[PDB]
Write a protein that binds this ligand. Structure first.
Ligand SMILES: [Ca+2]
Ligand SMILES: [Ca+2]
Lengths: 133, 132
DNA sequence: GAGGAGGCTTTTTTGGAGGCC
DNA sequence: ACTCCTCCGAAAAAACCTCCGGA
C-alpha cells in the first residue's frame, strides 16, 4: 500500500533546492514533479501544453522520474499540483516549487540523476539563469 | 554629493540573485555588501570576526567592491546592515540578502567581476552548495 | 493580507479645424 | 503698441486602485 511503498517527498539530495511551503500564496515560475515513470512520460506533454512552458525536462531518478519546468507566467504551487493530481488517479505524485532553479536542474543532469528528454536541444546552462546581457 | 555620485543598488547583472526586501523580518545566512574598495577591505575582516562566517570573499566590481558571505546562524538583513553602516560613517554602502547563493558567488568570479581575496583557498564550487 | 509597484482608468492639456447632418 | 471662440479627439499627466503576497 501507498504508506509502505510510496515516496513521501523528493529525494533527499534535492530537498534544499525546493520550497516546502506547498500551500503558499507566493507564486513561482519554476516547479518540479516527482512521480512514476509511466506518469512522468505522459505528464511531460500535458504540462508543456497546459502551462505553455518556457522549458521542461524529464529525468531518471532510480526507478522513478522527475519533471523540472519553467513557466512564462507565475502560478501557485497548489494550482500546479491540483492539475497534475487530477489527471491520473493512481500512484504517487509529489509537486513542489523550486527556489534554486539552476542548482535543481543541474543536479538533475548528474549522478544519480540523468536527462531522459528535454524541450530544448542541449538543455540549459548556468549562463541561462543569469540576466540576459 | 551622494545623490549624484553614489550607486543606489547593486550592479544590474546581480539583482535577480538578491532579496530587495531590506526591512524584512525574514532571516538568512547569505549576504552581499556593495561599497567602496577601501571600506570593503576593512569590512572583510570585521564581518569575518563579528559574524564568525563560514565563508567570505571580496570581489572587484568596476571601481568598487562587493563582499559575499555565508554565516553559521541566520540574521535579518537589517541587523547586518546596521552593523556595517555604523562602523564607517562615510561613503555608500548597499547591503542585501542573497536568495541565489551559488549563482551570486559564481557570477562574482567572472567578468566583469573577479575575486580579490577569499577565506578558503580555491574558493567555492557548485558541489559545495549541494547537500554534503 | 501589509504596502509598494505598476498598470488601468480618468482628467487635464492640447491643438486642428468648424460653419443649418 | 504688442494675450482670446468653440468643439471634440488625441495625448500627456495625474490619480487611484488592483495585484502580489513579510519574495
Ligand atoms: Ca560603513
Ligand atoms: Ca507569506
Amino acid at each position: 500500500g501507498s504508506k509502505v511503498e510510496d515516496p513521501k517527498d523528493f529525494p533527499s539530495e534535492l530537498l534544499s533546492f525546493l520550497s516546502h511551503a506547498v500551500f503558499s500564496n507566493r507564486t513561482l515560475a519554476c516547479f518540479a514533479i516527482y512521480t512514476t515513470k509511466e506518469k512522468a512520460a505522459l505528464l511531460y506533454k500535458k504540462i508543456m501544453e497546459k502551462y505553455s512552458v518556457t522549458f521542461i525536462s524529464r529525468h531518471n531518478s532510480y526507478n522513478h522520474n522527475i519533471l523540472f519546468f519553467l513557466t512564462p507566467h507565475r502560478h501557485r504551487v497548489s494550482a500546479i499540483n491540483n492539475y497534475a493530481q487530477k489527471l491520473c488517479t493512481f500512484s504517487f505524485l509529489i509537486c513542489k516549487g523550486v527556489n534554486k532553479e539552476y542548482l535543481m536542474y543541474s543536479a538533475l543532469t548528474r549522478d544519480p540523476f540523468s536527462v531522459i528528454e528535454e524541450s530544448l536541444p542541449g538543455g540549459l546552462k548556468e549562463h541561462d539563469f543569469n540576466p540576459e546581457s
